[PDB]
């Protein structure tokens, strides 16, 4: 009836950009007639400080009661001193994905008109633009495969991780990729290492089995090392890229960096009911936190992805997207999007949130 | 006494660039007084055509009798139609590495003075230059780990690959990295995914144990997804990067692409006796083969790495390196290194080989 959203702002700039996303959602709630209730829970570094662990039981139970999780960012210097297997990022994210079976990660990345110059690519490559959606399988492969651990002592002590995938796991994430490519430029590029990995031989086989249901979509396969190179030369020739868990982690981040604009990038991680966790692509930026400098666009577009995919409110989702476009093309830019001779034109976190919420209210 | 080299030219441009490397080696043999004998063996696509498999027994036995393998390139359209697990590249390279225990791969990559413009990076990043040596562990981890295979049928059919590393395996490749960083800029960046993988937790632990023998070398650790991004922003801040097998495959290729000059790049894969296989970093380029267009520099620098690391002939190795530098700075460039208004200034494969061999003879 009423929608229930668990709000997990986390660490660093999380809370200050989350405030702007809630301001924009308030404008959307009024314009479209939606009744949404929000509960806040601690997660990450702040949860370690307040509760002794990065994902408290009360937080986990709170997400169980919600229709979606609007997530900020976790991690920072303070806890970067604990062993990597106890740090807040992995400690919050891996159990949330496992617990809610969030097998599908979508990370849309594009070069926005007029910001091509921020990409680290040579200017004649970035002038061509790109628009790539990465679909990454998030609950299988080597992240959760067993056995995992270590045995032995001294020189012969060894550690082991198992990459495992079943046909059922590959076909469900491949179907999402093909369905997405239909709505875009009808091309899926599947990324694997089938010259070495048994998992990748199965991957490429099952992706070709799925392809028969999508005769209008072009399928190509590429090895992961070749993909990491080709994205530097012709990123405009990719449309949907479909990846297993580890290869998707690497490639989605490489493509995010090639935009030069990580403050604009959001991520959705969903299960088959469309419950999901929506978060900015970038990190907690603890050096700028509490200064009003942080770009809230990524957190605001996370809330748009959440309205579309979890709450099936397409019109509300696109109203936010258009309000963001209006900001970007009316010169409302934060400091990290400006060449530093432009730096004095930078808008603060709050001016961005006010502008975008006002544009939604105004009927954009 | 006499050195014995197995020559495995392979497919595509392999034979035409190998001819130039042998022409340059002939000049080195005369200038330094070295007696080297060469035997040629088929490998790759040509071996499939002549012998029915990509690594014939006679070839394998021939490499056993040699002091090093000078290797060209394998693979091409003709065989790209066989299953990926039967194609010539994996079919020649994985058993050669396993058989001879070639655990250490070195791939030096640098932006050469005056060719910065060919990099796909933005011009203000490539102007700063970079010079990164990738040390990749080549016989452990997920490439050769067991169990590997598949079980089950239908939707529940699954495939599995095991990533495994022992302390002994990590410490031997880490020692090479630290020893190399001493001779360069005294920094090792180790690349892992210790927030997820048991193998990476062990990796980072053992690398820190090795570090105690090298108090003058700075060590930092970085996650693989972060490394793939940071190489796009500050590649000048890395010196030696130390990687496990799969992460090294991805990162060494990303760095090769960032030079924009893969025709200049070579690779050494060695065991603890210093037997090795030396090859160009790039592929068989079957579209330009037999035209005299291909850049033989990578194959000539492979022969220099082979003289240095396998034959311990440092002076002969550096004479080749300097002859290459002389070519690059005397305008002897092949077509792929020229902006296509310059295209008519391109030298052919043979003019390059003649120039470099003549420079070695002249006492460069
Ligand atoms: C924190 C880490 C486990 C995580 C991952 O590897 O999935 C992060 O890199 C990401 O991409 O969301
Ligand atoms: C052909 C393939 C097995 C090989 C690898 O993955 O090592 C190649 O990509 C390389 O980098 O030499
Ligand atoms: Ca990542
Ligand atoms: Ca490779
Ligand atoms: Cl995986
Ligand atoms: Cl590995």
Residue numbers in the entry:
A (entry chain A), B (entry chain A): 1 to 364
What wording appears in the published article?
In this study, structures of 3-isopropylmalate dehydrogenase (IPMDH) from Shewanella oneidensis MR-1 were determined at about 2 Å resolution under pressures ranging from 0.1 to 650 MPa using a diamond anvil cell (DAC). IPMDH catalyzes the reduction of 3-isopropylmalate (IPM) to 2-­isopropyl-3-oxosuccinate in the presence of divalent metal cations such as magnesium or manganese ion and nicotin­amide adenine dinucleotide. In this study, the SoIPMDH dimer was crystallized in complex with its substrate, the IPM molecule. As a consequence, the SoIPMDH dimer adopts a closed conformation through binding IPM.
2 Å resolution crystal structures of the SoIPMDH–IPM complex were determined at room temperature at pressures of 0.1, 160, 340, 410, 580 and 650 MPa. In the structures at 0.1–650 MPa, with the exception of flexible loops on the surface of SoIPMDH and residues that adopt indistinct multiple conformations, no characteristic structural changes were observed. The volume of this cavity shows an initial decrease in volume, with values of 55.6 and 50.4 Å3 at pressures of 0.1 and 160 MPa, respectively, followed by a constant volume increase with values of 54.2, 57.6, 64.7 and 65.5 Å3 at 340, 410, 580 and 650 MPa, respectively. No electron density could be observed in the cavity at 0.1 MPa, while at 580 MPa two peaks were clearly visible. In the case of SoIPMDH, the volume of the cavity at the dimer interface is only 56 Å3 at 0.1 MPa and reduces slightly to 50 Å3 at 160 MPa. In the structures at pressures ranging from 0.1 to 410 MPa, the solvent-excluded surface at the bottom of the groove is nonpolar since it is mostly composed of the Pro108 and Leu305 side chains.
